[PDB]
């Protein structure tokens, strides 16, 4: 038995991949509508009937969200190589201290491609 909760956010950002070979399109300056899913695993409270309000999860993420949205990721410390993989771990590292029930972070650069980091 287990209960899991998730909430998706989308942020509009620029990035470029600094470690690909000279011809690669992703080494050019570009951007994406990045989707991030924060997944939480925990017990359902008998009174609230939830693990955590989706709104708390939003509120916890907001500070990190706002550093990402409408920004250039390469200028953010720890995102000098802003792959989806690096980004999902970085989001995990920012969010985990405030959301200890965090069990996975998914980031999708496009709606057909994504990465899931679990952390624990």
């Amino acid at each position: 038995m287990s209960t899991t909760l998730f909430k998706d956010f989308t942020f509009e950002a620029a990035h470029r991949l600094p470690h690909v070979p000279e011809g690669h399109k992703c080494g050019r300056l570009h951007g994406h509508s990045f989707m991030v899913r924060l997944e939480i695993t925990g017990e359902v409270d008998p009174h609230t009937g939830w693990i955590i309000d989706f709104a708390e999860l939003k509120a916890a993420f907001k500070p990190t969200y706002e550093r990402l949205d409408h920004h250039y990721l390469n200028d953010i410390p720890g995102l000098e190589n802003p792959t989806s993989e690096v980004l999902a771990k970085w989001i995990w590292d920012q969010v985990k201290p405030v959301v200890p029930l965090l069990s996975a972070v998914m980031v999708k650069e496009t709606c057909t491609a994504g990465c899931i980091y679990r952390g624990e």
Copy 2:
């Protein structure tokens, strides 16, 4: 090793009774709720499936009819109709008729949801 899922969508009203006064989720409202039933089992060597998708549809239909175009709070067991409670409630209704049931996901909106594994 092999998992199967089918998605359904229903149109229901609810409100959350145990939230503080200002919270908008305590007001009477509704959603286009989505529910995914996941099944796990061995694939039949002849039919080439665990179970026909139709069967999942037929099995779920009675529970679906209680939820669709209905007010959740009036259904026994759904007096605090969170996504979490609803997913467990759906599991409880469907598990007895679909013993291969391995998970229930409900999404209140396209960006928020709960998965219950039982």
Copy 3:
């Protein structure tokens, strides 16, 4: 040049003038999607008609009356069909957004209404 912005709100309604027994007459709800269309001149210097965020800000007061609410309680929405709601929204927004040229309301992902000028 036509510009648009989509909004989604989670609400309850019931249709009071449907034939007794039809499921739409029972208390229920939807994830409603609304699209506000404006048509007009792109300023040479700004490069837009109006900022997407200005249109959002103009819609916000109306949006808050619809979201996480029961539509029948709102004056003008006692028969809250998709058609009535599209016209209602038009009547609320056209005053604050003069360039408004269409309102689409989607009740579900597959069913909707579009209103302009009757």
Copy 4:
């Protein structure tokens, strides 16, 4: 009575808007997964049973597409103020000559926001 045809493309680009008031988030370097819908109108051919092949409409757009995808829009001449409105007309101006049957270009910055240019 009349028949319209459309084909949808998505590209991943960076941009910023240089004439928005100071502190606007749109004025910071950022990006999107842009969607563009090319709309044509005209007669169906009684033999082929279409106006044109979808693959040929794709092929026509390809040069302009590849200028947009994985690029920074502001470097492109005419996209110095790369709003959806400017972009939509810019795409019209590049694609109309190669596809005279073009009747509308929709560009969406995000899944919930966009512009449709018709020639006015």
Copy 5:
């Protein structure tokens, strides 16, 4: 103007007869079809017609398209999106006289609008 639309999806096979050696093969799509009606809203009911009625009016035509092979249906021997839109219109127009458009999308990224 007040307009109403309803979308359906059918799973069917087809091939295009008037193309060279290479989509000319037997294949299929999850076709999306959108029926658009234009009409006056009734003062009492609050609608043009019930969505459920539109579903019922289309149903026979949907049964004819869903889980079928389009080329066998008379009128759809060249089953392009353009021909289909107009053909679906021929079956539905008499049953739904307020019909104003039929959009068919063979993929999520490609389709046709007939008026």
Copy 6:
């Protein structure tokens, strides 16, 4: 910190029918390829998404705009069979493959793990 997964979706337009619903028809089939592995400290990824496209492309082209029932191994082309079929085709080319999901429609699917 721990496990990292990568996926990529593909859609192909194909005809099929089941010999055991059984009428001739087709779908816009969706397939997700899932990969698990270590992220390289230099590249910052497991493998490039485009690399995963390239590796799948030969199997893709056999499926896209084709009749599935004529393909060796897909005599009974159920999603279950198709997901497992795809796994067998793709695994040797993509060793880090951890799951294969095929969606017949938007609302129905199967996930396979070899």
